[PDB]
Structures are given as structure tokens and as C-alpha cells.
Design a protein around this ligand. Structure first.
Ligand code: TRP
Length: 526
């Protein structure tokens, strides 16, 4: 009899309660689950963005429909990330500057690009730009979602009819609270209030119990560290080193707040914005009646007061009379996410600036992979080693992807933007950029959207597809040196492919003209 009987989780934020809920649903009565609150510092709800797999991987597993959980956490919709002013110099401002007679913005939507002759639509767009017969931006040519988002449409018709692939904006504290109620009332997880006095270990350094300040020993076989940047178990108790990656991603601070919004004026933007600043970038996460916003910056390039004032100036806030969250970031990951019988999940495990909304996703993936590699009490090394490799490969892949946004940006007008070009580029990303310039697809999707979004593992093995690389590279002004050479041998395939551009144009009109506003759906939902 070697199976796990007791699990103890340290930390009661988003990571803690997502972990408690999922594992309790997965294991049922076979395991007792106990979560020790370890109270975190109370922050303004500054918003959080997600990716589509959240519903299928997580909420569907718990049996919770969006119609049920979204009203409980004031959730709203995300169709893309909108990048503002990453090509033009200037101050940190909310509005896009003008470049070549167009606003300086580009979108990074979800979903997979359609293909013709098994070549992605991106390559036909590149061919037409090279041929000089179009001057249309990549995102407006290849995604119908762009038109929807400019007209601030919902991603669905009011009666549930799907239109476009989407994810969510919400206040993470409300979600944690909703999940806490769910896990304790429905999944028989025991919530224990208070601080951890000490962590009890045996002769082999495995954890045997968490001792609470009232002297109670929370005994277990497996321990999940969800204590955030503190890493109270994985870093402090187990002495696992954290690998600082601030050398590669310079931003390490944020100043943030939530701002009340009059939605009747201009609606609710169904996308997360990432607004380029003098020494970093600011997020905007719109929900009904209010949006969350924060300036992510690098302390090597801006003073605290500088950032704070720039942030407030952009939103027209009085810096003296505005509640602000001032946060220092831990950028990087543990050498290993799982050590002995301690598994770190969430900020305890790793962190990147939220440029592409990876936070909740990293938790979800960690949770999912923990169940895929779930141990018994022998704790076979091959299980944790495999888990650690998947977590490491996931993190480093996205870290490199994020770095590319700053490296490929043409901006050089401040020391921050200029310093990004001086940073070492990882060999794998150097290769990707050279492939892209030669006209090759990068990580082309080989399945349809139904398979990709249907099976988590299909997406996990191909998370940043060709579409995403084109969104960012073409978005930032980088195009291939020449189109895919094989296309010059297939003119008939090229002539045929143009109908797909006509289809996107048709969808763009249809969506704008018949979809309800994001605002209207949110009011019907809430
Ligand atoms: N695998 C993700 C990739 C992705 C596309 N667009 C994004 C925008 C933000 C974050 C991730 C993404 C998805 O298709 O959903």
C-alpha cells in the first residue's frame, strides 16, 4: 500500500485554491486535502488575463459553466492582446501614435490560421506584401477578430452562439474566493486559517508535516507550495535555488491600480492592452464598470517615482490621491519545480512579466502535469524529473518568446528600449528569426482548432504556433526577406489562396454588423 493518502497545500490565493479544487476533484475520497491559508498581503484587484484552455482544462473538469462562474468573479472577455506603440518613439500614452497613416497597434488573437495547400495564410499574406499588391497589416488581413475588437464586440451572440475563440479577464481574488467556497463546500477540502510556524522534515529531508502557529501538525505525504514569491517550502525549507533571469528580461517592478470606467461612453474593450512605455510597458485589463492597469518597468532604467508619475500621467490620475500597488517582481524559475515531496505551483515556482498572460496558464499546466505525473509514496524520481522537464521547457519557451517582443521592437529612443537589443539572444530564437526571414513557418499547427483546444497535451506540445510568431514579428514591423520559395513554383495555389482573404473580409463585416457589443453581453451575464 504505497498510494498518497494526505496532501497539504500552503497558500490560499489563486494557485492554492485552483490546486485544491482540481486535485480534490481528481482524487475524490482517496486523499484528504488540507490548505493552510498563510495570509498574503492585501492588494488592489488590478486584473488578470487568461488563455482559452482555462475553461476546458480547469473549469470543465470541475463541472462549472462560464454562465455560473463568470458572474461570481466579475469576469469579462479577452479576444486578443493589443500591442500599442511598440514601433514608435514617445511618452507612455494610452492612445496609439500614427505610423504610415495608421495607428501604431497590432493584435495577437487566439485560434489557428487557416491553410491553403497546407501553407499557412500568413505566408500568402507575406507573398502579397512582397509582390506589392497589398499594404494591409498582417493581423487585419488574416484575422476576422481584428474588426470585431475595433468595434468592441462580444466574442459571442447573446444567446450563446460562438463567433470567435476567446478567454477571460477577471479579478483573481474573486476567483480564489469562488474556488475556496467551491472546494470547501463541495469537494471537502479543509481550510485551515493562519501562519505556518515551522516545516517538519525526516532524516531524508522529506516534509512530514506543516506546524501551525496554534501548534497543530498538518501531516501529509505530499506538499504543494503555493506561497507565492515567498517560496516558503520549495526555496526556504527545501533549499532549492531560484534561477534569476532578470538579465534576459529587464522588467522587475510594477505600479498598479484599478480605475472605475464609464462603459456607456465607449464600451468595454474585449482585449488586454499592452501599452509601450519609456522604460517598460503597461497592461490594461477591462471588465464591466472598471479596468485594471499596471506599469511594468525595469528598476535599472527608471526610478520608482518616475514610473509612478508616468503611470498616473497616462491615466490622468492624481498621484497624491490614488491608491497604488507597488510591487517588486521575482523573474525566473526554480532550478527544479518539484523536489522530494514538495511541488511548487504558481509564483512559488516561476514568474514572467504578464506580457502574454501566462500566469494562470502556468498554474493550470502545473496542476495538469502534476496529475499526469502523480506520485505514490515511493516518489520514483522519473516522475518528478519528467514533471520538472515539462515545467522547465514550458517556462523557458515562453520566456524566450517574451524577450523577442523587446528584441524585435524597432524602438531605440530610450536607454531601456536600446538596451534590449544589446541583450544576448538565445540560439533557438536566433534560429527562429532566421527561419522566419527565409520565409519558413515557425511551429506550424498540424491539427485543426477542435483538436488543439480539445486536448490539452496537443496545445502544450505546440503552444506558440506560427500564427503567434507572425502576430508578434509582423506586428513589430519584421517581415520575411522573401516569401516561401516553393510558392514561386505554385502560382495557381497562390491565385486560389486569395479567396481566403476575401473570406476574412466577409467575416469581418458579418461580425461587426451582427455581434452584440462586449458591454451588452457582460450586462446580460452580470
Ligand atoms: N496556445 C495559445 C497561444 C496564444 C495565442 N494568442 C495568445 C495571446 C495571449 C496568450 C497566449 C496566446 C492559444 O492558442 O490560446
Amino acid at each position: 500500500d504505497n498510494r498518497i493518502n494526505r496532501i497539504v497545500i500552503l497558500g490560499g490565493g489563486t494557485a492554492g485554491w485552483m490546486t485544491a479544487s482540481y486535485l480534490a476533484k481528481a482524487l475524490g475520497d482517496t486523499v484528504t486535502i488540507t490548505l493552510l491559508e498563510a495570509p498574503a498581503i492585501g492588494r488592489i484587484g488590478v486584473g488578470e488575463a487568461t488563455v482559452p484552455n482555462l475553461q476546458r482544462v480547469f473549469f470543465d473538469f470541475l463541472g462549472l459553466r462560464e454562465e455560473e462562474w463568470m458572474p461570481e468573479c466579475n469576469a469579462a472577455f479577452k479576444t486578443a492582446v493589443k500591442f500599442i506603440n511598440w514601433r514608435t518613439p514617445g511618452p507612455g500614452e494610452a492612445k496609439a501614435r500614427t505610423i504610415d497613416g495608421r495607428p501604431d497597434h497590432f493584435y495577437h488573437p487566439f485560434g489557428l490560421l487557416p491553410e491553403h495547400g497546407q501553407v499557412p495564410l500568413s505566408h500568402y499574406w507575406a507573398y502579397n506584401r512582397a509582390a506589392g499588391t497589398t499594404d494591409e497589416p498582417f493581423d487585419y488581413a488574416c484575422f476576422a477578430e481584428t474588426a470585431a475588437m475595433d468595434a468592441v464586440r462580444a466574442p459571442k451572440w447573446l444567446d450563446g452562439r460562438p463567433a470567435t475563440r476567446y478567454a477571460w479577464h477577471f479579478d483573481a481574488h474573486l476567483v480564489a474566493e469562488f474556488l475556496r467556497r467551491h472546494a470547501t463546500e463541495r469537494l471537502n477540502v479543509e481550510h485551515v486559517q493562519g501562519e505556518m510556524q515551522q516545516v517538519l522534515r525526516d532524516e531524508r529531508g522529506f516534509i512530514t508535516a506543516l506546524r501551525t502557529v496554534e501548534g497543530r501538525d498538518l501531516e501529509g505525504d505530499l506538499f504543494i507550495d503555493c506561497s507565492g514569491f515567498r517560496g516558503l517550502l520549495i526555496n526556504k525549507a527545501m533549499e532549492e535555488p531560484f534561477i534569476d533571469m532578470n538579465d534576459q528580461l529587464l522588467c522587475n517592478r510594477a505600479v498598479a491600480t484599478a480605475i472605475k470606467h464609464d462603459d456607456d461612453a465607449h464600451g468595454v474593450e474585449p482585449y488586454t492592452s499592452a501599452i509601450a512605455m519609456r522604460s517598460g510597458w503597461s497592461w490594461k485589463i477591462p471588465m464591466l464598470g472598471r479596468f485594471g492597469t499596471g506599469y511594468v518597468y525595469s528598476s535599472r532604467f527608471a526610478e520608482k517615482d518616475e514610473a509612478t508619475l508616468d503611470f498616473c500621467r497616462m491615466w490622468g490620475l492624481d498621484p497624491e490621491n490614488t491608491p497604488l500597488n507597488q510591487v517588486a517582481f521575482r523573474v525566473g524559475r526554480n532550478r527544479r519545480a518539484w523536489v522530494k515531496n514538495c511541488v511548487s505551483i504558481g509564483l512559488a515556482s516561476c514568474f514572467l512579466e504578464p506580457l502574454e498572460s501566462t500566469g494562470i496558464y502556468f498554474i493550470t499546466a502545473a496542476i495538469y502535469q502534476l496529475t499526469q505525473h502523480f506520485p505514490d509514496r515511493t516518489f520514483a524520481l522519473a516522475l518528478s524529473d519528467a514533471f520538472n522537464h515539462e515545467i522547465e521547457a514550458m517556462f523557458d519557451d515562453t520566456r524566450d518568446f517574451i524577450q523577442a517582443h523587446f528584441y524585435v521592437s524597432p524602438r531605440t529612443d530610450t536607454p531601456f528600449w536600446k538596451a534590449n537589443k544589446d541583450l544576448h539572444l538565445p540560439e533557438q530564437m536566433r534560429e527562429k528569426i532566421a527561419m522566419y526571414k527565409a520565409g519558413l513557418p515557425i511551429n506550424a499547427p498540424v491539427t485543426d482548432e477542435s483538436t488543439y483546444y480539445g486536448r490539452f497535451e496537443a496545445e502544450f506540445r505546440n503552444f506558440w504556433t506560427n500564427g503567434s510568431y507572425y502576430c508578434i514579428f509582423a506586428g513589430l514591423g519584421l517581415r520575411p526577406d522573401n516569401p516561401l520559395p516553393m510558392l514561386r513554383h505554385r502560382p495557381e495555389q497562390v491565385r486560389e489562396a486569395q479567396a481566403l482573404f476575401a473570406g476574412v473580409k466577409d467575416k469581418q463585416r458579418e461580425l461587426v454588423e451582427t455581434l452584440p457589443s462586449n458591454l451588452e453581453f457582460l450586462r446580460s451575464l452580470h
